[PDB]
Design a protein around this ligand. Structure first.
Ligand code: CHL
Ligand code: DGD
Ligand code: CLA
Ligand code: CLA
Ligand code: CLA
Ligand code: CLA
Ligand code: CLA
Ligand code: LMG
Ligand code: DGA
Ligand code: BCR
Ligand code: BCR
Ligand code: CL
Ligand code: CL
Ligand code: FE2
Ligand code: NA
Lengths: 44, 243, 35, 61, 238, 449, 336
């Protein structure tokens, strides 16, 4: 090998996550937005 | 509840509203009997006397054909899955004890016991038993009692009873004292009976056509739906393909 | 590249979550009319 | 026994042609449904008997 | 990763993983090298894998040295399925013959400064005469483009205009090497091989190599550059 | 029906007049269902009327017979037709069922009850009744689950389905042990749509097909029971618009995505759309060209690993951007192709060199030759080949016809979703007619925009 | 009472009082379009050569690499990639990413997202303003065409190299190659598109000249005619009846537009539906449906082939065929 790559193409890779921290930060960011949205309810 | 869907002027008819205005029904079927769909293309009903007289025979045919439907479908299936029945198929069950070949009775779950009594004894007790019962039915006279619903009743209970619906001795579990649920169950009974009559006549013509029992018919049909049906069986042998 | 992938991934899921929950936040009530 | 199948099928086509012409004009005529119930049911009954006849006679053809 | 489990994976288990550009690595075996059985050998399934590409770069201060380059192409550079024959003698004298297989790969690298350097990473027609520890020799290098190639203004060796026809007055001028003559003459490359991690049980070997070859000359144009390539190689015997 | 003065909708929007007329609406729907069943029967009988036993079904402009044959009716090993009676029976059952549905549609359109609320409360509904809207959704979800399970039953016990991946050219095989693994089922869904992954279009085996159908049937029945026995939550009530035109807009966006997905399925998938019945895909025809030009030049005594192109890349064989060996030429862009005629020649390193040199098969070679000679290339005249070719061959691929038609339909149905989403939002808001001219919102906003 | 951070942000995003409306479609549009704008400008100025055809023949494309405004283009993604989704984190180096046409794919994906959310944002502003909602439906025509030349044609042809180069001469090249392979001129949907833009110019000049023909006198010869129109005024500024009578006695008295409402509906619907049809023309030629093939259509009684204008088109088409991708081909029939 001459250079370092992810080589994430193909493989049926779900959501394109090759490491679990990607799924964790996706779930976490959607969760933070849901948290602010949920606590900012009973408004308007 | 919901007895305004089988009786009264508003009731389920043998055709829906678009194809049958409510004024097209015979006047003698205006919702007074269980299973009144106003089904009368040929005027056999005349009036209420002939309608309830024919309902007597309809109800007896129903109560026979329902037990018949169960008795044709059950032992054939038991033999097909492996019971020791030897004659479950209905149109050849009588042919078993032609030469003394008495049938094997399945007292499921504790059965497969040999019946040690021949065809002559079977038929002699069958006439002397059901002839006695049917003479009782037209007379309303019954000798003894000890029914679970009312225990050890004397003979002075069948008089005064409603004909074709003799509650009491013939009602061990009751569940018909409410006229509402009794009417609902009357509709249920007559509709189940008509369904079973259609089912047993279908059993007969299916047997005459396919040469086998109806449980075999439904099993082979569920195995091969297109490869085993009416248009498959009347073919005789294969089909010249169209390629 | 993996650091860039995690950064773009959190940016995209942040903005898409904003879109999802903004349209969940009672959007047919933003009209200026009656009804 | 093929000829009876073609006669049954062509009779079915004629019945269906009459049904395509007649069922809408019977439906949309003023008070024509109330008086043409019998002819419409007769057409539908002959149609169904001919469909079943063609299907059954194909198994023998 | 050995050759045993490489064959044990299907297409879809290596699809897009990058495993398909990797030569097998003999995990078992020894490093003593001398235990190779000499004889008339016909090696089959020769495998070749680079691990660094360097280009000789000319500098204003006179320092001539090989620079580190960025691989512009993706994983299309390794060589598999090469065949040939080789001999092993009593003292260790080995000659190497390479005849058929996928022994070439067009490769493009970036000099620092953003200059594209296309070079045909090739090992075709290699004659490696030497010892078991090291054996070197020449190999044929095709130019890059064939003669039937044509440049953006037609032209080229076999198929083309043979003239810059986009301007009808510059037909015969100092652009002789660009339009009048097109040169595709195949050059010669220099490579050095080494053997390590032999396996006499299943007749397979490993080792590192060291190649030096020129680049594309742009069909008789601006001068080529010498390409120093280092990597690992793999093969099997008979 | 009605006129414009009693409805406010002109004739070019006359169906809108029956938004609130539940009986006529139901009749229009079932009359349409009769049209769909009628076209299926009419076109199916027309196709078996125009069917030639010799030529395969992709040469003859057939688009329904390949569907039936994919189900495994009338075909055997390799894809040759054994009988057309299943196709004829399918067409006839469809025609007669269309007659029945058309009778029902004509009945409710002409003399059926105006509204089903005052007399048949099970069937009559208002559009803002979220309970009954979910009830009808649950009924239809149960119906969809039953259909999916009918396909599962057909694949498991009713003759099996056609597999192109079975050895020997493919055949009708009975599916045993479908992939019920949830990870395998939903990894297709969560998959990217791009090259190498293809979203759900890259399902490539019948075990995955029937396992995904088991999952969709069970989830559809479960969702049907859930919708019949629940009512929408307040967050959904706030998130949505609850008019009939809004429900239509939702359906339009959904079926527009479905139409685009069907376009991509017809153009790329070869296991649900077996290449024997539907012709070769674009990638299949390109790989077939490179393959047969490899084997011709091998039989003419030439080397294939050597002989690079004019570009120095490899005329027959090159390496893909990930490493494994692929076919040379511009067909490198279709290196992602996987077919039953390449897999017996394809190993761990991509195309195996010794296997590609030695282990050729006659049926594979003929299949590659035909997938060259019948590429999905054609005109609107049904003239085969590129647009510069002669008028000698009469062929346009069914894949081309299906992909083009369904992309067009998917696009217009997305636009119809826009039209109905906007109009439903504006009708719920009070904007469907125009600005009020005395309560104009912009006049209540500050200037400078 | 409205003190929470999300609700304050919601009222900021959905506010009509902004100079530029953002909305929930704009919160997807604005980052994507800004990313696409940034990468497009940077790539157009300083993008190194791009191997579009996958045959190691990189095309320069950028101004600093010797191109002008007409010739500079963001070069499509490599043919070796195909449709394989090439982002930066997939590439080993930015050098490799720039070699394999990565900026084109980045700009195309972000631009498709940006135009989809632009159409959504047009709807959403029309919703918050009390407007009617179908201006987004009208904008769905150029969006469809952009997606047809940036998404659908690459998908149907297997490679993003088949997409329209983000340039001027690249656009011309895309047309020449497209007509070579597909004969778009002989396609009814493209004929409809040409009729749509020709009728668009027709009806734009028509309606503008009828409104300008029937302007009402408020100003003098000192003042420009537009000075007779006041912003927000209630009275209509021109005589619709005078223009309508003019047009009726000009061509046909009955066959004019007596409703200005219906006239403006026609103005909207004609180029929108024709651009829809021609966008599907590209979309159907992506899956190789092509234009009409009328070559050797007329022959004489003795079977000789008469040349025809379609055959002259075929000759020019062959010239457009063989020269395009001159080195990328190894086999006779161009199935790929
Ligand atoms: C009540 C209705 C009833 C019906 C529909 C049939 C019908 C049939 N019995 Mg049957 N049986 C019936 C009652 C009775 N059978 C028999 C005794 C027999 C015999 C002994 C035989 C039949 C046979 C048959 C079949 C040929 C005729 C036929 C399907 C014959 C058979 O099975 O032929 C294949 C046959 O051998 N039946 C008795 C006892 C006397 C019955 C009492 O009710
Ligand atoms: C996120 C949503 C993005 C949608 C567009 C992105 C591009 C989608 C795409 O790459 O499209 C193609 C994909 C399929 O991808 C292909 O998938 C194929 C799978 O085939 C493989 O697997 C198959 C299994 O049978 C076969 O074996 C086949 O031979 C084998 O190669 C190949 O891998 C191809 O390389 C790969 O490109 O389709 C699909 O995913 C279907 C999904 C829908 C795509 C719709 C495209 C048009 C989109 C919007 C148009 C709307 C416009 C409205 C506004 C204006
Ligand atoms: C979505 C279809 C649909 C729905 C919701 C209705 C609903 C209704 N119909 Mg109706 N109808 C339909 C289709 C439908 N119909 C069709 C196709 C026909 C032609 C046969 C008819 C002909 C018809 C008549 C003549 C009448 C009604 C009437 C009525 C009303 C009540 C009485 C009734 O149940 O009718 C009865 C309908 C039947 C008995 C048909 C058999 C239905 C069984 C249960 C089939 C089981 C369905 C099964 C899943 C098969 C579906 C296969 C599918 C894949 C295609 C009611 C609101 C009555 C009315 O108008 O009241 C004034 C009335 O007179 N319908
Ligand atoms: C032999 C059994 C039998 C008998 C005696 C009856 C008797 C009766 N039925 Mg019934 N029915 C039956 C079987 C029977 N049914 C079956 C199997 C079905 C299912 C299809 C039905 C479904 C049915 C409906 C839906 C209705 C009736 C009704 C009636 C009543 C009035 C009809 C009439 O004209 O009078 C007498 C009828 C006969 C004497 C039947 C003559 C049979 C001929 C001789 C044989 C014809 C061959 C046949 C095709 C097989 C009546 C008391 C109506 C009612 O209101 O109930 C109170 C009505 O609504 N029936
Ligand atoms: C899928 C196509 C379709 C369907 C199913 C319908 C259905 C319907 N439309 Mg409609 N429409 C359509 C397309 C369609 N339309 C199109 C394209 C336009 C634009 C021109 C219109 C414009 C329009 C307007 C302006 C109106 C309707 C209305 C109606 C409803 C009542 C029509 C009526 O009874 O008047 C009577 C019609 C007739 C008497 C002629 C019909 C005769 C038959 C049914 C024609 C077909 C014969 C068929 C072959 C027979 C089959 C029989 C079977 C046994 C095989 C009805 C449910 C009306 C409405 O909304 O209700 C308030 C209304 O005013 N439509
Ligand atoms: C001009 C209108 C038109 C026409 C003529 C067609 C025609 C066609 N479309 Mg279609 N479509 C249209 C409009 C149209 N479409 C529109 C406007 C959309 C929305 C954009 C779609 C979206 C669409 C999709 C998503 C698909 C099609 C597909 C198809 C093809 C097959 C249809 C099919 O089988 O579906 C299926 C029929 C049903 C779902 C009805 C139920 C049938 C049951 C469930 C099947 C039972 C089979 C069972 C296993 C048999 C065994 C029996 C027993 C032993 C178990 C067909 C040629 C398919 C295709 O081939 O893709 C290219 C496909 O997937 N279309
Ligand atoms: C199953 C989907 C569906 C359904 C149920 C409806 C239902 C409805 N639509 Mg609608 N619409 C849809 C999809 C749908 N639409 C699509 C896909 C589009 C394209 C963007 C539209 C665009 C549209 C507009 C612009 C309007 C409606 C309107 C309406 C309402 C009245 C329709 C009417 O009678 O017009 C009458 C029908 C005709 C006059 C016949 C149209 C003839 C067309 C032009 C011929 C096309 C045929 C040709 C072969 C197509 C080939 C293209 C392609 C396949 C290559 C009605 C409730 C109206 C409305 O908003 O009312 C509230 C209205 O203004 N729709
Ligand atoms: C117009 C109508 C719509 C048009 C077309 C729609 C068609 C199909 C829609 C479904 C397609 C597949 C969906 C899943 C896609 C996916 O997960 O991508 C996941 C992919 C995967 O990403 C790549 O995957 C590769 C292997 O799979 C590699 O691992 C790469 O490293 C990795 O980056 O990333 C993306 O495509 C980006 C998604 C960002 C989505 C932003 C827009 C969302 C906006 C609103 C959402 C509303 C709700
Ligand atoms: C690679 C992984 C990423 C894949 C993405 C998909 C992950 C699975 C989520 C599927 C949940 C289905 C949502 C339907 C209802 C949403 C409407 C809503 O919101 O309705 C809202 C409604 C309002 O009352 O509330 C409610 O109904 C309650 C909302 C229920 C949603 C449950 C969320 C699961 C946990 C959230 C994150 C864990 C948070 C951690 C980060 C926080 C900071 C560290
Ligand atoms: C209401 C309305 C309408 C209509 C609608 C619809 C849609 C209807 C329909 C309907 C339908 C949907 C129909 C269908 C039908 C069918 C039929 C009528 C049939 C049949 C049959 C037959 C007879 C056949 C025969 C045969 C066979 C069996 C096979 C072989 C061959 C032949 C063909 C011989 C309109 C729009 C106008 C207007 C508005 C209103
Ligand atoms: C059969 C089959 C299979 C399976 C499949 C499946 C299982 C599917 C499914 C699936 C699913 C399970 C899906 C889902 C979906 C959904 C969607 C697609 C949606 C949606 C929606 C939206 C988009 C939303 C929106 C919104 C928001 C965002 C918020 C606010 C509100 C609203 C509404 C606006 C497979 C492939 C394996 C194979 C082949 C065959
Ligand atoms: Cl070109
Ligand atoms: Cl080519
Ligand atoms: Fe105007
Ligand atoms: Na070429």
């Amino acid at each position: 090998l001459v250079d370092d790559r992810m080589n994430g193409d193909g493989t049926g890779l779900p959501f394109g996550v090759n490491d679990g921290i990607l799924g964790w930060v996706i779930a976490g960011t959607l969760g933070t937005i849901w948290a602010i949205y949920f606590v900012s309810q009973k408004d308007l | 509840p919901d007895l305004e869907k089988w009786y009264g002027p508003d009731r389920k008819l043998f055709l829906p509203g678009g194809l049958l205005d409510r004024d097209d029904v015979p006047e003698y079927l205006n919702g007074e009997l269980a299973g009144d769909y106003g089904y009368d293309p040929l005027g056999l009903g005349k009036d209420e006397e002939q309608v309830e007289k024919y309902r007597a025979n309809e109800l007896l045919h129903a109560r026979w054909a329902m037990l018949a439907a169960a008795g044709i479908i059950i032992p054939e299936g038991l033999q097909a899955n492996g019971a020791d029945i030897k004659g479950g198929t209905w149109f050849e069950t009588g042919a078993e004890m032609l030469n003394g070949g008495t049938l094997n009775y399945f007292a499921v779950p504790f059965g497969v016991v040999q019946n040690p009594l021949p065809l002559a004894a079977v038929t002699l007790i069958e006439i002397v038993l059901l002839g006695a019962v049917e003479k009782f039915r037209v007379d309303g006279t019954g000798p003894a009692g000890f029914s679970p619903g009312v225990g050890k009743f004397d003979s002075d209970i069948f008089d005064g009873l409603d004909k074709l619906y003799p509650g009491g001795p013939f009602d061990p579990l009751n569940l018909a004292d409410d006229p509402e649920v009794f009417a609902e169950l009357q509709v249920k009974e007559i509709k189940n009976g008509r369904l079973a009559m259609i089912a047993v006549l279908a059993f007969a013509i299916q047997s005459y056509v396919t040469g086998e029992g109806p449980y075999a018919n439904i099993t082979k049909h569920l195995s091969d739906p297109f490869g085993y049906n009416l248009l498959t069986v009347l073919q005789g042998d294969d089909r010249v393909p169209t390629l | 590249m993996l650091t860039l992938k995690i950064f773009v991934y959190t940016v995209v899921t942040f903005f898409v979550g904003l879109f999802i929950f903004g349209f969940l936040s009672n959007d047919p009530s933003r009209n200026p009319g009656k009804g | 026994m093929t000829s009876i199948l073609q006669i049954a099928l062509l009779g079915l086509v004629l019945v269906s042609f009459a049904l395509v012409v007649g069922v809408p004009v019977v439906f949309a005529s003023p008070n024509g449904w109330t008086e043409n119930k019998g002819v419409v049911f007769s057409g539908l009954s002959v149609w169904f008997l001919l469909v079943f006849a063609v299907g059954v006679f194909n198994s023998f053809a | 990763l050995t050759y045993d489990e490489l064959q044990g994976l299907t297409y879809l288990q290596v699809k897009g993983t990058g495993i398909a550009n990797t030569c097998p690595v003999v995990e078992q075996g020894t490093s003593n090298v001398r235990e190779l059985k000499p004889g008339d050998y016909k090696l089959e399934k020769f495998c070749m894998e680079p691990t660094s590409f360097t280009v000789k770069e000319e500098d204003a201060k006179g320092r001539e040295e090989f620079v580190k380059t960025k691989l512009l192409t993706r994983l299309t550079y390794g060589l598999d399925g090469m065949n040939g024959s080789m001999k092993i003698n009593n003292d260790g004298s080995v000659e190497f013959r390479e005849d058929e297989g996928l022994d070439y790969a067009a490769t493009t690298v970036k000099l620092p400064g953003g200059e594209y350097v296309p070079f045909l990473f090739t090992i075709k027609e290699f004659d490696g005469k030497g010892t078991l520890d090291s054996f070197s020799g020449d190999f044929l290098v095709p130019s890059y483009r064939g003669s039937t190639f044509l440049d953006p203004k037609g032209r080229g060796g076999a198929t083309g205009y043979d003239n810059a026809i986009a301007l009808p007055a510059k037909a015969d001028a100092d652009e002789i090497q660009r339009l009048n003559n097109k040169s595709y003459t195949p050059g010669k490359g220099s490579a050095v091989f080494s053997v390590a991690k032999v396996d006499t049980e299943t007749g397979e070997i490993a080792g590192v190599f060291e190649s030096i070859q020129p680049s594309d000359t742009e069909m008789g144009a601006h001068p080529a550059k010498d390409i120093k390539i280092t990597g690992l190689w793999y093969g099997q015997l008979t | 029906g009605r006129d414009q003065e009693t409805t406010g909708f002109a004739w070019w929007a006359g169906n809108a007049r029956l938004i609130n007329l539940s009986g006529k609406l139901l009749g229009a729907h079932v009359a349409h269902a009769g049209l769909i069943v009628f076209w299926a029967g009419a076109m199916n009988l027309f196709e078996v009327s125009h069917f030639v036993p010799e030529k395969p079904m992709y040469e003859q402009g057939l688009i329904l017979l390949p569907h039936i044959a994919t189900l495994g009716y009338g075909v055997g090993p390799g894809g040759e037709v054994l009988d057309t009676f299943p196709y004829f029976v399918s067409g006839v059952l469809h025609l007669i069922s269309s007659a029945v549905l058309g009778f029902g549609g004509v009945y409710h359109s002409l003399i059926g009850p105006e509204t089903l609320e005052e007399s048949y409360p099970f069937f009559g509904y208002v559009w803002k009744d979220k309970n009954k809207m979910t009830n009808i959704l649950g009924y239809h979800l149960i119906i969809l689950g039953c259909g999916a399970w009918l396909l599962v039953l057909k694949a498991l016990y009713f003759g099996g389905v056609y597999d192109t991946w079975a050895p020997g050219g493919g055949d009708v095989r009975i599916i045993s042990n479908p992939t019920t693994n949830a990870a395998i089922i939903f990894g297709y869904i969560v998959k990217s749509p791009f090259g190498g992954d293809g979203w759900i279009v890259s399902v490539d085996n019948l075990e995955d097909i029937i396992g995904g159908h088991i999952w969709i049937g069970t989830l559809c029945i479960l969702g049907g029971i859930w919708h019949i026995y629940t009512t929408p939550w307040p967050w959904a009530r706030r998130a949505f618009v609850w008019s009939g035109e809004a429900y239509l807009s939702y359906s339009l966006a959904a079926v527009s995505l479905m139409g685009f997905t069907a376009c991509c399925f017809a153009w790329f998938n070869n296991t649900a759309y077996p290449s024997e019945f539907y012709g070769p895909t674009g990638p299949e025809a390109s790989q077939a060209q490179a393959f047969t030009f490899l084997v011709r030049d091998q039989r003419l005594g030439a080397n294939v690993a050597s002989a690079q192109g004019p570009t120095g890349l490899g005329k027959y064989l090159m390496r893909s951007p990930t490493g494994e060996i692929i076919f040379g030429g511009e067909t490198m862009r279709f290196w992602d192709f996987r077919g039953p005629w390449v897999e017996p020649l394809r190993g761990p390193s991509g195309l195996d060199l010794v296997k590609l040199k030695n282990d050729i098969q006659p049926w594979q070679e003929r299949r590659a030759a035909e997938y060259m000679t019948h590429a999905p290339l054609g005109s609107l005249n049904s003239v085969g080949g590129v647009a510069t070719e002669i008028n000698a061959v009469n062929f346009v691929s069914p894949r081309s016809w299906l992909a083009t038609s369904h992309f067009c339909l998917g696009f217009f149905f997305f636009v119809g979703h826009l039209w109905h989403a906007g109009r439903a939002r504006a009708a719920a808001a009070g904007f469907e007619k125009g600005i009020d001219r005395v309560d104009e919102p912009v006049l209540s906003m500050r200037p400078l925009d | 009472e409205n003190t929470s951070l999300w609700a304050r942000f919601c009222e900021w995003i959905t506010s009509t009082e902004n100079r530029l409306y953002i909305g929930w479609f704009g919160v997807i549009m604005i980052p994507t379009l800004l990313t696409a704008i940034s990468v497009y400008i940077i790539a157009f100025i300083a993008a190194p050569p791009v191997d579009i055809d996958g045959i190691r023949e990189p095309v320069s494309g950028s101004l600093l690499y010797g191109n002008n405004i007409i010739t500079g283009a963001v070069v499509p993604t490599s043919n070796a990639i195909g449709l394989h989704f090439y982002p930066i984190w997939e590439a080993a180096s930015l050098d490799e990413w720039l070699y394999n046409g990565g900026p084109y794919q980045l700009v195309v994906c972000h631009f498709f997202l940006g135009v989809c959310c632009y159409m959504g944002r047009e709807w959403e502003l029309s919703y918050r303003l009390g407007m009617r909602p179908w201006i987004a439906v009208a904008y769905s025509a150029p969006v469809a065409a952009a997606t047809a030349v940036f998404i659908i044609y690459p998908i149907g042809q297997g490679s993003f190299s088949d997409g329209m180069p983000l340039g001027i001469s690249g656009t011309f090249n895309f047309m020449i190659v497209f007509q070579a392979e597909h004969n778009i001129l002989m396609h009814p949907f493209h004929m409809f598109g040409v009729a749509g833009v020709f009728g668009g110019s027709l009806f734009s000049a028509m309606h503008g000249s009828l409104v300008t023909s029937s302007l009402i006198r408020e100003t003098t010869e000192n003042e420009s005619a537009n000075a007779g129109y006041k912003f927000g005024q209630e009275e209509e500024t021109y005589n619709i009846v005078a223009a309508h009578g003019y047009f009726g006695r000009l061509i046909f008295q009955y066959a004019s537009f007596n409703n200005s409402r219906s006239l403006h509906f026609f103005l909207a619907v004609w180029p929108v539906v024709c651009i829809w049809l021609t966008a599907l023309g590209i979309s159907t030629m992506a899956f190789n449906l092509n234009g009409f093939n009328f070559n050797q259509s007329v022959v004489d009684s003795n079977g000789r082939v008469l040349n025809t204008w379609a055959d002259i088109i075929n000759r020019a088409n062959l010239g457009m065929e063989v020269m395009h991708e001159r080195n990328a081909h190894n086999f006779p029939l161009d199935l790929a």
